Design an enzyme around this catalytic site. Sequence first.
Site, PDB file in Angstrom:
ATOM      1  N   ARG A  55      -2.364   6.258   8.678  1.00 65.74           N
ATOM      2  CA  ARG A  55      -0.898   6.265   8.624  1.00 65.74           C
ATOM      3  C   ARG A  55      -0.403   7.510   7.891  1.00 65.74           C
ATOM      4  O   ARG A  55      -0.620   7.613   6.667  1.00 65.74           O
ATOM      5  CB  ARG A  55      -0.447   5.020   7.862  1.00 65.74           C
ATOM      6  CG  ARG A  55       1.001   4.613   8.076  1.00 65.74           C
ATOM      7  CD  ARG A  55       1.238   3.208   7.464  1.00 65.74           C
ATOM      8  NE  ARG A  55       2.645   3.017   7.183  1.00 65.74           N
ATOM      9  CZ  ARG A  55       3.179   2.891   5.968  1.00 65.74           C
ATOM     10  NH1 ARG A  55       2.441   2.901   4.874  1.00 65.74           N
ATOM     11  NH2 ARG A  55       4.480   2.714   5.857  1.00 65.74           N
ATOM     12  N   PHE A  60       6.861  11.782   3.293  1.00 67.03           N
ATOM     13  CA  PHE A  60       6.676  10.516   2.572  1.00 67.03           C
ATOM     14  C   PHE A  60       5.247  10.412   1.938  1.00 67.03           C
ATOM     15  O   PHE A  60       5.079  10.597   0.719  1.00 67.03           O
ATOM     16  CB  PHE A  60       6.964   9.355   3.522  1.00 67.03           C
ATOM     17  CG  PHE A  60       6.759   7.948   2.898  1.00 67.03           C
ATOM     18  CD1 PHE A  60       6.721   7.727   1.494  1.00 67.03           C
ATOM     19  CD2 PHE A  60       6.693   6.834   3.759  1.00 67.03           C
ATOM     20  CE1 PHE A  60       6.534   6.429   0.935  1.00 67.03           C
ATOM     21  CE2 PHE A  60       6.548   5.547   3.246  1.00 67.03           C
ATOM     22  CZ  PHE A  60       6.486   5.317   1.815  1.00 67.03           C
ATOM     23  N   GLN A  63      -1.760   7.929   4.124  1.00 68.11           N
ATOM     24  CA  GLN A  63      -2.384   6.658   3.702  1.00 68.11           C
ATOM     25  C   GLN A  63      -3.777   6.571   4.321  1.00 68.11           C
ATOM     26  O   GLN A  63      -3.923   6.852   5.488  1.00 68.11           O
ATOM     27  CB  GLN A  63      -1.558   5.459   4.133  1.00 68.11           C
ATOM     28  CG  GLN A  63      -2.177   4.144   3.598  1.00 68.11           C
ATOM     29  CD  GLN A  63      -1.273   2.970   3.920  1.00 68.11           C
ATOM     30  OE1 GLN A  63      -0.090   3.180   4.249  1.00 68.11           O
ATOM     31  NE2 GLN A  63      -1.819   1.740   3.860  1.00 68.11           N
ATOM     32  N   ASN A 102      -0.998  -1.902  -1.371  1.00 66.66           N
ATOM     33  CA  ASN A 102      -1.256  -3.302  -1.576  1.00 66.66           C
ATOM     34  C   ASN A 102      -0.426  -4.171  -0.636  1.00 66.66           C
ATOM     35  O   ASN A 102       0.424  -3.665   0.106  1.00 66.66           O
ATOM     36  CB  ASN A 102      -0.996  -3.715  -3.078  1.00 66.66           C
ATOM     37  CG  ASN A 102       0.452  -3.526  -3.518  1.00 66.66           C
ATOM     38  OD1 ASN A 102       1.394  -3.982  -2.855  1.00 66.66           O
ATOM     39  ND2 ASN A 102       0.638  -2.819  -4.672  1.00 66.66           N
ATOM     40  N   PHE A 113      -2.611   5.844  -1.119  1.00 59.79           N
ATOM     41  CA  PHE A 113      -1.747   6.835  -0.456  1.00 59.79           C
ATOM     42  C   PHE A 113      -1.616   8.077  -1.362  1.00 59.79           C
ATOM     43  O   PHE A 113      -1.586   7.973  -2.596  1.00 59.79           O
ATOM     44  CB  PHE A 113      -0.360   6.291   0.012  1.00 59.79           C
ATOM     45  CG  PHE A 113       0.481   5.628  -1.072  1.00 59.79           C
ATOM     46  CD1 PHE A 113       0.226   4.293  -1.496  1.00 59.79           C
ATOM     47  CD2 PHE A 113       1.544   6.297  -1.631  1.00 59.79           C
ATOM     48  CE1 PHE A 113       1.031   3.644  -2.497  1.00 59.79           C
ATOM     49  CE2 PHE A 113       2.342   5.723  -2.644  1.00 59.79           C
ATOM     50  CZ  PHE A 113       2.096   4.369  -3.088  1.00 59.79           C
ATOM     51  N   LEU A 122       8.721   2.890  -5.602  1.00 59.63           N
ATOM     52  CA  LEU A 122       7.411   2.218  -5.689  1.00 59.63           C
ATOM     53  C   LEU A 122       7.005   1.965  -7.155  1.00 59.63           C
ATOM     54  O   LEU A 122       6.007   1.306  -7.457  1.00 59.63           O
ATOM     55  CB  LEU A 122       6.347   3.089  -4.955  1.00 59.63           C
ATOM     56  CG  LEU A 122       6.722   3.200  -3.431  1.00 59.63           C
ATOM     57  CD1 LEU A 122       5.698   4.106  -2.771  1.00 59.63           C
ATOM     58  CD2 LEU A 122       6.783   1.851  -2.698  1.00 59.63           C
ATOM     59  N   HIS A 126       3.300  -0.404  -7.285  1.00 66.04           N
ATOM     60  CA  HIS A 126       2.038   0.178  -6.826  1.00 66.04           C
ATOM     61  C   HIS A 126       1.457   0.934  -8.014  1.00 66.04           C
ATOM     62  O   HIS A 126       2.195   1.648  -8.684  1.00 66.04           O
ATOM     63  CB  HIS A 126       2.309   1.173  -5.705  1.00 66.04           C
ATOM     64  CG  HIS A 126       2.797   0.506  -4.461  1.00 66.04           C
ATOM     65  ND1 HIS A 126       1.922   0.051  -3.500  1.00 66.04           N
ATOM     66  CD2 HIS A 126       4.009  -0.023  -4.148  1.00 66.04           C
ATOM     67  CE1 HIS A 126       2.602  -0.607  -2.566  1.00 66.04           C
ATOM     68  NE2 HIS A 126       3.874  -0.640  -2.918  1.00 66.04           N
TER      69      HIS A 126
HETATM   70  N1  LIG Z   1       2.961  -0.792   3.458  1.00 71.11           N
HETATM   71  N2  LIG Z   1       2.650  -1.095   2.122  1.00 71.11           N
HETATM   72  S1  LIG Z   1       1.498  -0.213   1.378  1.00 71.11           S
HETATM   73  O1  LIG Z   1       0.939  -0.874   0.282  1.00 71.11           O
HETATM   74  O2  LIG Z   1       0.521   0.136   2.357  1.00 71.11           O
HETATM   75  C1  LIG Z   1       2.252   1.173   1.034  1.00 71.11           C
HETATM   76  C2  LIG Z   1       3.443   1.171   0.279  1.00 71.11           C
HETATM   77  C3  LIG Z   1       4.070   2.402   0.012  1.00 71.11           C
HETATM   78  C4  LIG Z   1       3.522   3.597   0.469  1.00 71.11           C
HETATM   79  C5  LIG Z   1       2.359   3.584   1.254  1.00 71.11           C
HETATM   80  C6  LIG Z   1       1.723   2.355   1.512  1.00 71.11           C
END
Ligand SMILES: NNS(=O)(=O)c1ccccc1
Length: 165
Positions: A55, A60, A63, A102, A113, A122, A126
């Site tokens: 992803r 942004f 991931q 998460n 990420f 976040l 996170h």
């Molecule tokens: N979709 N929720 S996540 O934990 O994978 C996340 C959150 C925020 C940024 C990247 C990934």
Amino acid sequence: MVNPTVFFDIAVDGEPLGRVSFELFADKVPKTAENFRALSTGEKGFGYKGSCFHRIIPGFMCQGGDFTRHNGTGGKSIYGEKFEDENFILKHTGPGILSMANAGPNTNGSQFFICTAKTEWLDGKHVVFGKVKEGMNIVEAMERFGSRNGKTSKKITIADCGQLE
Ligand SMILES: NNS(=O)(=O)c1ccccc1
């Protein structure tokens, strides 16, 4: 006593792109830092080598870390499938921050990420545990292969990974 450094060698449809190295804040989040370090060396018999960044959203984050299902639905930590939110001392201050993905409170596994923008919404949800030291320019190059919906236009993989001196 010195925070460890880990490196990923990135490839793009199997072609070498470059190396990204990270400082892991074992001084602030030892348990979360240690999970990522061990998954990066593969010393537990599993981890990040060969896995993909599934992803990627320009403006942004990138991931990755889903080494069991390759799509955001898998991965496991070195402690069991999931572990707790260690603390939220470190905040999402800008590009280069390394933080845990998460699925709700106390659900850390292996997915993470790398921020390419400040993501302060976040904070406190996170766990931030590291930051890009070398190769942010490689992270930016990876980022170009993402899209608005996060689908990548070429396969982005961790060709090799480990711990640096
Ligand atoms: N979709 N929720 S996540 O934990 O994978 C996340 C959150 C925020 C940024 C990247 C990934």
